[PDB]
Design a protein around this ligand. Sequence first.
Ligand code: SF4
Ligand code: SF4
Ligand SMILES: [Cl-]
Length: 252
Amino acid sequence: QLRRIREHPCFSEKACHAFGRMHLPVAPKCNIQCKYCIRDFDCVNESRPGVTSRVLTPQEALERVDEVLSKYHYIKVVAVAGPGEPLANEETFETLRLVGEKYPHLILCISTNGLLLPDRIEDLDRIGVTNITVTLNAVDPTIGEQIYDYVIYKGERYEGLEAAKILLDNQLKGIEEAVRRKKIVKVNTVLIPGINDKHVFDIARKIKSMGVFIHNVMPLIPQYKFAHIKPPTPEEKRAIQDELSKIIKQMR
Ligand code: SF4
Ligand code: SF4
Ligand SMILES: [Cl-]
């Protein structure tokens, strides 16, 4: 195959060399704190590091779509991926509702840390989102606890193992529900040497059974509490990716 994969640069190798995507930075708030993230910068799960985007209101974001779709025609996808957690900001839903209603041809895409995916998947479906990226760095909460300072869920900040268990249970429930609703799911995993760099095999097996379409293993960008960790070398990353390809399709 369907068009939401074939023409999405992040879900098809062929589409990456042919079609473009644009991000609308309408979602400044975040609801967790990753130990590799400095909040000054656009969510590094779905952005190159060290970037500071101007935050747009839904109306301004629609205006940027208008102008981009005028100067360029290769644009197939419009997404919200930052600067914080898209599902933690009502402006995400207002923006994609405006874009989808005016430009039904565009593929609507979102990235999420997954915490609010169970609570908001019904909204995403109703507004026409067909592609969802979830960043899943652990399927064992004792490993998750090593990756997150805290999560904010339903008006309470949690730390430690409790926070990790709340996050993981919601990520899995949300992915399951997204798959049930025939959404195309991509899972990002930040490869963190010494923390989840062999656990990623367990992640791949789990998301494969759950119906995730593609897996994107990203090398750690050392920052914040992980600033001292030596990132995986390129050849180290390709070796893991090559092995994980026998479990689930890898984004290359
Ligand atoms: S999800 Fe993590 S990396 Fe992304 S903005 Fe929130 S704390 Fe930073
Ligand atoms: S949110 Fe992620 S998958 Fe969607 S267009 Fe942006 S980079 Fe690609
Ligand atoms: Cl389609």
